[PDB]
Amino acid sequence: QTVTILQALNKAALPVLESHHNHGQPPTKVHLLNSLVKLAERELVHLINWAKNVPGYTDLSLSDQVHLIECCWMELLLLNCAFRSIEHGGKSLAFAPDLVLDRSSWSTVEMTEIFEQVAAVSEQMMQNHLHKDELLLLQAMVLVNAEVRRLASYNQIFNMQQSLLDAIVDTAQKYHPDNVRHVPAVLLLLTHIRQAGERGIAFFQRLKSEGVVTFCDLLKEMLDAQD
Amino acid sequence: QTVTILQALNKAALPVLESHHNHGQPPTKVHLLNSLVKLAERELVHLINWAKNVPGYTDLSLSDQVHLIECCWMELLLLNCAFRSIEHGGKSLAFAPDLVLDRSSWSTVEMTEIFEQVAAVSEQMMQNHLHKDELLLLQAMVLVNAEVRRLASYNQIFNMQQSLLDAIVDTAQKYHPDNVRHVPAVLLLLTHIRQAGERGIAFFQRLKSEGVVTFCDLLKEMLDAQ
């Protein structure tokens, strides 16, 4: 049920990670990005562990479990960050409590178009009074909506999508009763997260290629899963 | 209300255009792309014209009107092509009646990734038994959701989103009564259209830059907006 899904997603809630960024050295492009890149990798390991808790997911084929993650990992990172950043009303993005970056920083690391979209999404979440339970459902949704093409596990993914859709609708009724515009408006945010994700991955691929910023192999395999 | 919005969106909504593609010549990459490219410029003219019928739009600043189209034109094209192709159930894309492309062709023009995503979306529309009125609302929604950053006409764009959101919910009740999953599942298709749109625009810019396939001025400028 909606209730069972939510309990599951909630006892698997991602913890918040510190960046342990060294603020003792000034924020060069390289300095910030190495913290951002590896904050990403730690949150990445967590997502993977978290995904296996999304009800139905461990019943997909291994290849498709990996595939879903390969499609949407960056979206999940950005989606989370947006929610972490809800209090800043679009003024900054909180990648970690340890690492809040404003538009100024975004320019330094040359990820302005990306973070400007995310930050705006953050503001929309704030404006739509999004509850944690709704966000939990949203990430699960981002995951199961990762690939639109037909996979071997098509059936099971369909079943998960249907269950998630019901849970989102019921959860919206709980925290925002009789508001028919809410779920659609919030789902519309996902289109921006998707756009941000795509640009995100493209940027990280070119970071990888510039070889200055160091990637560990987990993040690096994710990048090489595209092209 | 829902109805008056719907009457408006219907006015000058994209028609079927023939590409007048010449099948007498081999379906090379260049030959196909010249048809797709010229088909695109013609549909773009329709889009520009259609947009002005989306209620509220002509009240946006001129600047924001241009910006919205610049953001989402490609998504609008693919969304339409998906809806034109709904009968082919994901097997091929009917860019025009005279220009229907299956998976084999997509390879020739090296747009496999894009069209596979569009074709899959098409199958989803078919499976959700999507009605035209719904597609009309979807197009308008694609347009007014184009940019999430704050524009000068933020206030008015927001009003437009709200009224469209109402009309979408009512139109869903009419054609798919009491189905709580219909609207959400359908809106989720928009994320895939966005990804394909983004890839489309990239593909076309690299086409423009390799100077072999020829772009008109309308198309060349939309591309130079990114």
Author numbering:
A (entry chain B): 248 to 474
B (entry chain A): 248 to 473
Give the original sentences from the paper that presented this experimental model.
To understand the mechanisms by which constitutive activity evolved in the Crassostrea gigas ER (CgER), we used X-ray crystallography to determine the three-dimensional structure of its LBD at a resolution of 2.6 Å in the absence of any added ligands. The domain is in the classic active conformation, and the backbone conformation is similar to that of the human ERα (1.36 Å RMSD for all atoms). Unlike other SRs previously studied, there is no electron density of a ligand in the interior of the CgER LBD. Rather, the internal cavity where ligand binds in other steroid receptors is occupied in CgER by several bulky hydrophobic side-chains, including F425 and F525, and – to a lesser extent – F524 (using human ERα numbering to facilitate comparison). These hydrophobic residues would strongly clash with estradiol as it is oriented in the human ERα LBD. The resulting cavity has a total volume (168±8 Å3) much smaller than that of human ERα (402 Å3) and too small to accommodate estradiol (245 Å3) and other steroids. First, it indicates that CgER is an authentically ligand-independent transcriptional activator, which exists in the active conformation in the absence of ligand or other apparent modifications. Second, the presence in the protein interior of bulky residues that occlude the ligand cavity provides a physical rationale for the inability of mollusk ERs to bind or be activated by ligands. Examination of the CgER structure suggests that the historical substitutions confer constitutive activity not by filling the ligand cavity per se but by stabilizing the active conformation in the absence of ligand enough to remove allosteric control. Replacing leu with the much bulkier Phe fills this cavity and acts as a sort of linchpin that improves packing of these helices against each other, presumably stabilizing the active conformation and providing a structural explanation for this mutation's potentiating effect on activation by the receptor.
In vertebrates and some invertebrates, members of the SR gene family are hormone-activated transcription factors, which regulate developmental, reproductive, and physiological processes. The protein's ligand-binding domain (LBD) serves as an allosteric switch controlled by the hormone, which binds in an internal hydrophobic cavity deep in the protein's LBD; ligand binding shifts the domain's thermodynamic equilibrium from the inactive conformation when ligand is absent to the active conformation when ligand is bound. In the active conformation, AF-H packs against the body of the protein, contributing to the assembly of a new surface that attracts coactivator proteins that alter chromatin or otherwise potentiate transcription of nearby target genes. In contrast to vertebrate SRs, mollusks contain a single SR ortholog that is unique in being a ligand-independent constitutive transcriptional activator.
